[PDB]
Curated annotation (Swiss-Prot), chain A:
Extracellular membrane side: 355-362, 404-412, 469-497, 551-590
A family per Pfam: Band_3_cyto
Resulting phenotype, residue 31 to A/R: Impairs expression at the cell membrane
Protein name, UniProt field: Band 3 anion transport protein
Organism: Homo sapiens (Human)
């Protein structure tokens, strides 16, 4: 399917006058040339010339063809080709003795260039001595343009079992007309001319005298370009005479696109030739038996028990050293610093809320310790270290409902959770035993986009709700009492708190946006500019803490953490919970009926974990390494259960935080995402720092609560870039004249996008209203009811081509 | 291999160049026109049928075109 | 300036005597909002989000639109005092 092509020229060495064969260019689906230094240039496509191809055709219409030659060595091939040249009266008998000595000559590769000092073009003469060309020369085009590591890449690009072709060029003053010789070996055989171990199948030999409008390097390039095509190579594999080769060459030239010189070429008109070439390519495969090229799975059902687990282990673990090593950039440190605040603040908020909700049966210290434990364990033993675990909202409402039901029935709260965890352990073992996660394949882009957009919208609304609460706590009055005690909390309003908080948030957001924009600017040396823009969030945070720390009299709400490693409620709880019973015996009916909430917990965790893993690990976000699904689920449920045994709460992967973490460890190209930095160190550092947060009272005591609001708004706004549903909503307002050149705009009508997006937005509105409904626990169910809609209802309204064009598994490919 | 519409298009393309029309205005015989025609065709490039995507191949040809034009106006 | 305590038995008939709690910060907020809105509408004039006639007429009155928005905003606020323009009574 692919071969190796080597251009050889007869050159002369500067040190002592003698002739040798020198390589000049290589072809593995692309052309590479070598300069005077001895280093090959950058890969590029091949662009031949009119005269070279014209003379190639002229010499090939009458050149000889040798098929199925039974030779292995160079001497026999040269003798046979010279005999065939003599037979057809193309070369004189008195010239063979010189030609055989000229051809059977030493071949030198690039490694011997500096050992000789460089090479120059040479011309053979009747005597046999090198000579300078008589016609004037000019610098070659490819070596002047493109030439101003690689061998290993050459070694893998060649297929393990394939053939090679060699093309030889050279000028001879004692000849009449140029001659071309094409020979195909019966069996691929090695040759001493090429040091590469690839065997050789075809051989071209090109001779002739000097004449105007003939350049031998360019014609050799043309021959190599002709040989590089797959269709012509197959034709050569099946050719029986010269007529078929002539017809193939005529077809190759017929479906070729030549463009003339112009005065002021422009990239706008030049992009009107995109279809035309395609059509020509189609014509090239209209008469070709082959088909055009440019027009294992992480998940698969397995017949053996626990196949997915071992598959993921063997697929992931061999990258451990690379994952450890890849964390030596300061961008990782900046991302760690960012995620530290981004993970502590919701943890503190949820810990406080649960503290006032369950009468301090569940507090802050327990959940932070649990978070550290399930983060460190998942970072050491996980397959995808880009996920961040943490508490969520549905977990909170579930805990509230469970506590209310237990209060109604009169049962304990911390005791039933142990049996809940036991049932979760049994369910997760049963599910992983049957590897029933393949259902994730049924989820297309539709529900994923819906979930991401609704989560981001809820995040933004929560941030604004906290800010409006900050105003409502201290309204705008004319008189304020100064004799108020503020030790637990300031009683009564204060003069300048809300406005200062709003100003601080605006400053944080504005500085973050300015640094983000300046990162892509061109205002400094590249290293310094990238380093400065890499630390935008800590820079803004430091500037704002200096600014408000300079302010003395005004009060702003600050971060608070518990004092020490103490349980939330030492009055009725201990470090170890007795499963049998603390104050009252646990009823048999309660353990036998505890299976019901475990199902809901498992369903919630399952759905959120796989949808988050799908969103983070999309192929579009230049994710080269694979992502495991079953082992990560096993880990998260296992640590959740073991934490529930000790009384600490279970957690789950967080969508927004993980997406921001992925975006932080993203290297962009000058735009295009160049690569993503994958490592495990960030999780360990985050877990260690959140664990040590109790030891850093002086630092967190000076951080206001309002500054992190700007950071939250920044994260919420930034995490909406990759969403395509948001782009379609933006296109709902643009006129059809300014729509982009994506396929799903041209292929279907505009009001069809409007109908699709309207149905989707109705689905989101239903999700929001059921979220606000007190029967919020039935929120996931309708979500899975979205699955039939794409599989059944949409083909009843749209068509298969349209549905494949909109709900495409790939973004660029549709 | 003769489509007269394409031949007329080629003649129009020849006439569309500044240098060729300047030489035709300054011409006095057929040899000068032949020399101008060969000079015009010397700075033209052929793109073979390649299996690469169309967009990258079409945007990669800008520098060689710049080189050809820079050699043309010398 | 910003202090911890302010006297509330202060005459405000001729001009503001003594410091006041919420004047400077609200004034700064108004300025920042006005500048941000003016820049946003100036940019939106050159955008491609509406029919050309409607987009151009909307962008043409960007500065008065921002001014009217902010006068509505501070007019809705009642208790705090903000400095206003004063003109001579007659010729
Ligand atoms: C701890 O729990 C007991 C009984 O549930 C309760 O009386 C006490 O107030 C709790 N301690 C708190 C809320 O600090």
């Amino acid at each position: 399917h692919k071969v190796y092509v080597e251009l050889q020229e007869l050159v002369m060495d500067e040190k002592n006058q003698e002739l040798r064969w020198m390589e000049a260019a290589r072809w593995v689906q692309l052309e590479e040339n070598l300069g005077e230094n001895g280093a090959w240039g950058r890969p590029h496509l091949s662009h031949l010339t009119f005269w070279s191809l014209l003379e190639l055709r002229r010499v090939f219409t009458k050149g000889t063809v040798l098929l199925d030659l039974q030779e292995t060595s160079l001497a026999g091939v040269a003798n046979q080709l010279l005999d065939r040249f003599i037979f057809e009266d193309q070369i004189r008998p008195q010239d063979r003795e010189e030609l055989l000595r000229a051809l059977l000559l030493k071949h030198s590769h690039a490694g011997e260039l500096e050992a000789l000092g460089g090479v120059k073009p040479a011309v053979l003469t009747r005597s046999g001595d090198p000579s300078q060309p008589l016609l004037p020369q000019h610098s070659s085009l490819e070596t002047q343009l493109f030439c101003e590591h690689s061998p290993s890449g050459i070694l893998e690009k060649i297929p393990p079992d394939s053939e090679a072709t060699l093309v030889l060029v050279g000028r001879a003053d004692f000849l009449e007309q140029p001659v071309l010789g094409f020979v195909r070996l019966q069996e691929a055989a090695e040759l001493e001319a090429v040091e590469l171990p690839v065997p050789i199948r075809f051989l071209f030999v090109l001779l002739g005298p000097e004449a105007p409008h003939i350049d031998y390097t360019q014609l050799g390039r043309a021959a190599a370009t002709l040989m590089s095509e797959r269709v012509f190579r197959i034709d050569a594999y099946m050719a029986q005479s010269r007529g078929e080769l002539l017809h193939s060459l005529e077809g190759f030239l017929d479906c070729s696109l030549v463009l003339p010189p112009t005065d002021a070429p422009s990239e706008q008109a030049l992009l009107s030739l995109v279809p035309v070439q395609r059509e020509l390519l189609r014509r090239r495969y209209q008469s070709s038996p082959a088909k055009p090229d440019s027009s294992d799975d992480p998940l698969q059902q397995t017949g053996q028990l626990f196949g997915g687990l071992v598959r993921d282990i063997r697929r992931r673990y061999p990258y451990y050293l690379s994952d450890i090593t890849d964390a030596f950039s300061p961008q990782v440190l900046a991302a760690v610093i960012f995620i530290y605040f981004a993970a502590l603040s919701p943890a503190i908020t949820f810990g406080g809320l649960l503290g006032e909700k369950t009468r301090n049966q569940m507090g802050v210290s327990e959940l932070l310790i649990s978070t550290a434990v399930q983060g460190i364990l998942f970072a050491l033993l996980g397959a995808q270290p880009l996920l961040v675990v943490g508490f969520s909202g549905p977990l909170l409402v579930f805990e509230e409902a469970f506590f209310s039901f237990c209060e109604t029935n009169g049962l304990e709260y911390i005791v039933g959770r142990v049996w809940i965890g036991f049932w979760l352990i049994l369910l997760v073992v049963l599910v992983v035993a049957f590897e029933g996660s393949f259902l994730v394949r049924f989820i297309s882009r539709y529900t994923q986009e819906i979930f991401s957009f609704l989560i981001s919208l809820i995040f933004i609304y929560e941030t604004f709700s906290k800010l409006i609460k900050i105003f409502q706590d201290h309204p705008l009055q004319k008189t304020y009492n100064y004799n108020v005690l503020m030790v637990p909390k300031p009683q009564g309003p204060l003069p300048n708190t809300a406005l200062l908080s709003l100003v601080l948030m605006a400053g944080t957001f504005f500085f973050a946006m300015m640094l983000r924009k300046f990162k892509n600017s061109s205002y400094f040396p590249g290293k310094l500019r990238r380093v400065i823009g890499d630390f935008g969030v800590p820079i803004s945070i430091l500037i704002m803490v200096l600014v408000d720390f300079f302010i003395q009299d005004t009060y702003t709400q600050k971060l608070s953490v518990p004092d020490g490693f103490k349980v939330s409620n030492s009055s009725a709880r201990g470090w170890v919970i007795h499963p049998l019973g603390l104050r009252s015996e646990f009823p048999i009916w309660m353990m036998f009926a505890s299976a019901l909430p475990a199902l809901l917990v498992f369903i919630l965790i399952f759905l959120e974990s796989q949808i988050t893993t799908l969103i983070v690990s999309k192929p579009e976000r230049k994710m080269v390494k694979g992502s495991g699904f079953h082992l990560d689920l096993l880990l998260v449920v296992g640590m959740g259960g073991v934490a529930a045994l000790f009384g600490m709460p279970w957690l789950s992967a967080t969508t927004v935080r993980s997406v921001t973490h992925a975006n932080a460890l993203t290297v962009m190209g000058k735009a295009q995402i160049q690569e993503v930095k994958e490592q495990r160190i960030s999780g360990l550092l985050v877990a260690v720092l959140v664990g040590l947060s109790i030891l850093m009272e002086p630092i967190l005591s000076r951080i206001p609560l309002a500054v992190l609001f700007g950071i939250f708004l920044y994260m919420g706004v930034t995490s909406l870039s990759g969403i395509q549903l948001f782009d379609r909503i933006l296109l709902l307002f643009k006129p059809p004249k300014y729509h982009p050149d994506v396929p799903y705009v041209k292929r279907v009508k505009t009001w069809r996008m409007h109908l699709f997006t309207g149905i989707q937005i109705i689905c989101l509105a239903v999700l929001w209203v059921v979220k606000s409904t007190p029967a919020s626990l039935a929120l996931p169910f309708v979500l899975i009811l979205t699955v039939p809609l794409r599989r059944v209802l949409l083909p009843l309204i749209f068509r298969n081509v349209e549905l494949q064009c909109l709900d495409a598994d790939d973004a660029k490919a549709t």
